[PDB]
Ligand binder design. Structure first.
Ligand SMILES: [Zn+2]
Ligand SMILES: [Zn+2]
Lengths: 108, 108
């Protein structure tokens, strides 16, 4: 599972053309109080919520990693370029997000 | 704010026609590890995530309380009746949920 996490991370870095400029991105699994995922752009570290991680599907992990890595590419000034890239990879992004929240809400 | 919480709760109980059969519903604010809200149907208690609560708008609290109180009305066997009532109160329920997750993700 941890090997698949780093494999998706490595594939996502290549598809987003980020291998040029950084690629030294790490994934840290820790409990987060109010977020599913976060990223430290200075430490180049993606933090995934330990309490949510067991319940995530392959599509959801891929969506979450692409969303966080895109903060290394485009910021608030290029929000249109950010959403364009995110939508081209995941045009069903709203249904992914809706199904994730529903699943986490029902699952005990 | 706590007075507005109990006032929305009281109004939601009346609009959902739940004042007949129970109405002795309580709201408890506690930190939750993987949920925004939860309900104990036996203890008639709605639990709202302490870490998320400061960031919720009036529409979001109203949506969350109606969603949890509707578990007292309709279960898995009447999922169509559950969604029908939820959609008639909040037909923009998907946009509410999408904007909430985005806001919590951006806010630090
Ligand atoms: Zn993000
Ligand atoms: Zn619910």
């Amino acid at each position: 599972d941890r090997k698949i996490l780093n494999e998706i991370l490595s594939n996502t870095i290549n598809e987003l053309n980020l291998n040029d400029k950084k690629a030294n991105i790490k994934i840290k699994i820790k409990p987060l109080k109010r977020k599913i995922a976060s990223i430290s752009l200075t430490n180049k570290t993606i933090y995934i919520n330990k309490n949510i991680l067991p319940y995530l599907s392959d599509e959801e992990i891929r969506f979450i990693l692409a969303h966080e890595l895109l903060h290394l590419k485009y910021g608030k000034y290029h929000i249109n370029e950010f959403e364009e890239e995110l939508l081209f990879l995941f045009p069903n992004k709203e249904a992914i997000l809706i199904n994730l929240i529903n699943k986490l809400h029902q699952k005990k």
